[PDB]
């Protein structure tokens, strides 16, 4: 975010400003996070309440996403929610009962389940079957 | 699972009586510098 009113920095909408900051505007794309959140949030597993999302910003900010949230589908309203979240450090529901989006203290490790398996997505890593992988893992643990 | 919409402002501003008081502080400071 940056005061021009604060706006979520975008690769296309803002090019001169990020040049002044000295950051490569190729790495200035929040919509990629938006689509990942959109496809991830709407997945049936979230509807089953078996998935919970964390976001680690490039700056080092860790954001906890409550599964109950319904982020806007359009990017423009999505940007408005990020700037509110980053400045206020939390987002409250319309009914005002829970904090859907909340910034939390790093590291991620403390927040994660006590027994859990950790993996990354690596193009160079060996190709695996997601279904076979999850079956062979234990039940009490998480991934 | 339950679904609740997030509450946010279209444009974030970090009522007028507070605005009036804010200008007083600037006027108090600006005048004191001129007196000094």
């Amino acid at each position: 975010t940056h005061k021009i009113k604060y706006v979520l920095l975008n690769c296309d909408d803002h090019q001169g400003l990020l040049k002044k900051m000295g950051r490569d505007i190729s790495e200035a794309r929040p919509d990629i996070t938006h689509q990942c959140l959109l496809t991830l949030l709407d997945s049936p597993i979230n509807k089953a309440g078996k998935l919970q999302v964390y976001i680690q910003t490039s700056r080092g900010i860790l954001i906890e996403v409550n599964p109950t949230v319904r982020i806007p589908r359009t990017f423009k309203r999505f940007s408005g929610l990020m700037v509110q979240l980053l400045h206020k450090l939390s987002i409250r529901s319309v009914n005002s009962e829970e904090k859907l989006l909340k910034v939390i203290k790093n590291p991620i490790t403390d927040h994660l389940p006590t027994k859990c398996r950790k993996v990354t997505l690596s193009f160079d890593a060996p190709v695996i079957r997601v279904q076979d992988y999850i079956e062979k893992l234990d039940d009490d643990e998480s991934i | 699972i339950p679904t609740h919409a997030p509450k946010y402002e279209e444009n974030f501003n970090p009522k007028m009586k507070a605005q009036l008081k804010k200008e007083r502080k600037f006027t108090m400071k600006e005048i004191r510098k001129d007196a000094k």
Partner: peptide, 11 residues
């Protein structure tokens, strides 16, 4: 109740 591809209300 929001469902499917419905977007959050705009005021």
């Amino acid at each position: 109740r929001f469902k499917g591809d419905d977007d959050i209300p705009y005021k």
